[PDB]
Design a protein that fits this description.
This is part of a larger assembly, with 2 copies of chain A (about 170 residues).
Chain A (H helix, E strand, L loop, with lengths): L26 E5 L12 E3 L2 H8 L4 H10 L12 E5 L21 H10 L28 H11 L9
PDB class: viral protein
Keywords: 6-fold neck region, viral protein
Entry title: The Neck region of Phage XM1 (6-fold symmetry)
Amino acid sequence: MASISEVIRVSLQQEGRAIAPDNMNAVGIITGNQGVLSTADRYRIYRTAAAVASDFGASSQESAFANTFFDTTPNPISAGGVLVIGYWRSASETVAATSATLVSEQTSESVLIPLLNAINDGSFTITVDGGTEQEVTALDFTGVSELSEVATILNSAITGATVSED
Amino acid sequence: NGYFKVTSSTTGATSLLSYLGVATSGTDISAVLGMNSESGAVLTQGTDQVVLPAETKLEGITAIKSEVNIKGAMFIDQILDADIPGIASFAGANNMLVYEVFDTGYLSKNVSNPVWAVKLAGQSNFRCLLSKSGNRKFAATYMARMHTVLFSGQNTAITMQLKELS
C-alpha cells in the first residue's frame, strides 16, 4: 500500500520563498496596522497575493492593496522583483516583554548531524540565571537524523526553557 | 587440462617424493615431462589422516577475497548482529561491497540497531537492504542489478532507484 507520494511528491499551492533582491523594482507598501508587524518586525517580503492574505487575512486592508498590486498584468514580480510591507507606529505600540533568546549562527544542518551522531555522551552548561546555573550532561544524539530531534533533546535537557529549530 | 596427475593408491601418510628422477637403464622422460626436481612442480605429500578444521566465522570471508578478488559478496545465512561491524570494517578495508538484508525489526535510528550503527560509522561499503519476509534472494537480484556496468562506454553509470529486479 506504498504510494507515489514518497518518490514523486506532487502538491499544490506552495508559495515560493521570497528574498530581498538587488533589483530596482522591489517596491514597498507601508501599512499602519500593528496587528501583525512590530517595530522589530519592521517589514516582510512577498511574491504572491495568496501568501499576503494568508499572513494578514483576506479581509485586511493590506490584503486588498496586495490584490490591486498583483492584478496589474505587467507585475513588478514579472521583472524579478518583490513586494514588501513595512510598518510605522501609527498608534500606541504595545510590545509585550519577551524572554531571553539564544540563536545558533550555524544554519548548516548537514555538517552538524555526524558530529552529534559520533558523540555518545554530552555536556552542556546554560544559565537561565533564575538560580543555580545548569549542569547538563546526559546528552545522546545517536538517534538523530534531523535538527528537530536535537532540538527536542535539548528541550528535555534544559529546565524552564524551551528550545526549537527555525 | 594440460596437467599430469600422479596419485598413489594408498591414502594417508604415503609420500610420492620423487620428481621422476632418472634411471641409468634408459632414455629419460622426466626432463621433457616437466616434473623434475628443478622443474616447477606442485607435490602435495599425502596428509597423515582426515582433518577437521574448526568452524570458521563469516569473517573467514577473508579467505575468499584472498583467492578470487571478487568485488560483491553475499552470505546465504543472515549475518548475526555481533558480526555486522566486523564484516563492515572488512568491507571497508578490502575494497569491496557486501549486500545484506534485514527484516523490519532493524527499522530504527537506534544504536542497538546494527544498520544505524553502520550508518553512523560511515561503513558505506556494507549495503543494507530490507525485506519483511527476510527474503535473502533479494540480495541476489540486488547484487545482480548494481554491478551491470562496463566503465568504458559513453554513459553507463547507473543508479538503482527504480530498477527491475527478480
